[PDB]
Amino acid sequence: MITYNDFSKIDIRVGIIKEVSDFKEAIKPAYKLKIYFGDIIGYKNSSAQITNYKKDELINKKIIAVVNFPPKQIANFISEVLVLGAITGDGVKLLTPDGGEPGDKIA
Amino acid sequence: MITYNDFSKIDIRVGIIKEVSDFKEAIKPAYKLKIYFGDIIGYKNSSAQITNYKKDELINKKIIAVVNFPPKQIANFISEVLVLGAITGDGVKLLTPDGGEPGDKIA
């Protein structure tokens, strides 16, 4: 129902979470994440509904994100990337790469 | 580059690799993978350039795949889904979910 070309339009990278705070103003329970995506992209912020994880579980965790969306305002915060996770019977479960560095690209 | 809708159009699921064999006719080194995506989608086949993994590393592994591409013929084989992995300095590294069941959808 899409093309292989449609998927190539999406820029999906490995990132590493470096800071986590509560997103107090958000409707949904959420964290503000500051994520490093390597020497060229640098740091981007994200809103993520992943409060099933404790903050200490996310520090230095390698995650996967869409990095070429338009910035999304949510209250007074700008979410710059979308962190990918599966919607499961036990909440959102992050996607992780088996290995890789921040800024590595999904094929 | 895109909008959120460009991403939402892509159907990305958790699947589990059930069978792995060598894709002997492919010019790139690749495995043929039979992957279970839950009781609605069922089984799908994929060609994956992940021969840096041993076959016994992949059996029972939860992976992430795009499930709504058109089928892609590669030699005499039809690859039905795209298994997602990061392109790293040490080869392709599969994406895995932290948890989830086959057919669970990426948000």
Burial (CB count <10 Å: 0-12, 13-18, 19+), residue B40:
exposed
Cα B90 to Cα A10, A68, A93, A101, B86, distances in angstroms: 23, 25, 25, 10, 10
* DSSP reduced 3-state for A13: strand
**A14 to chain B, minimum CA–CA distance in Å?**
7
B7: closest CA among A82, A31, A102, A91?
A82
As given in the structure block, the two tokens for residue B94 are 């599969």
Contact A7 B68 (CB under 8 A): no
* DSSP reduced 3-state for A61: coil
Range(s) of the domain holding residue B77: 1-107
Residue B63's CATH number: 2.40.50.140
Spell out the long-range contacts of A58-61 with Cβ–Cβ below 8 A and sequence spacing 24 or more. Answer: A58/A17, A58/A20, A58/A31, A58/A33, A59/A17, A59/A18, A59/A19, A59/A20, A60/A16, A60/A17, A60/A18, A61/A16, A61/A17, A61/A94, A61/A96
- Quickly count helices (H) and strands (E) in chain A: 3, 10
A103: closest CA among B87, B91, B46, B103?
B87
Residues 67-86 of A with CB under 8 A from B: 68-70, 72, 82, 84-86
**Could you give the CA distance from residue A107 to residue B23 in angstroms, rounded to a whole number?**
19
This structure was determined by X-ray
Q: For strand B12-22 and strand B62-66, is the pairing parallel, antiparallel, or unpaired?
A: antiparallel
Q: Considering only alpha carbons, which residue of chain A is nearest residue B79?
A: A4
Q: What does residue B97 show for φ and ψ, rounded to 5 degrees?
A: -80, 150
* Those residues with Cβ within 8 angstroms of residue B73's Cβ, 6 or more apart along the chain or in another chain: B79
As given in the structure block, the two tokens for residue A100 are 């890789």
Q: Which helix (H) or strand (E) holds B94?
A: strand B91-97
Contact A10 B6 (CB under 8 A): yes
Which residue, chain included where needed, has tokens 């990426």?
A: B106
**Could you give the CA distance from residue A26 to residue A97 in angstroms, rounded to a whole number?**
28
A63: closest CA among B83, B97, B7, B4?
B97
Question: B62 with B15: CB under 8 angstroms?
Answer: yes
Query: Taking the CB of residue B7, how many other CB atoms lie within 10 A of it?
Result: 20
As given in the structure block, the two tokens for residue A96 are 């992780």
Question: A84 with B106: CB under 8 angstroms?
Answer: yes
**A64 to chain B, minimum CA–CA distance in Å?**
9
Quickly list DSSP for B7-64: HHTS-EEEEEEEEEEE-TT-SS--EEEEEE-HHHH-EEEEEE--TTS-HHHHTT-EEE
Question: B45 with A45: CB under 8 angstroms?
Answer: no
Which residue, chain included where needed, has tokens 């086959």?
A: B102
Residues from chain B that touch A72, judged by Cβ atoms under 8 A, are 4
Record the resolution, in angstroms. 1.7
Domain count of the fold of chain A: 1
**Could you give the CA distance from residue A64 to residue A48 in angstroms, rounded to a whole number?**
12
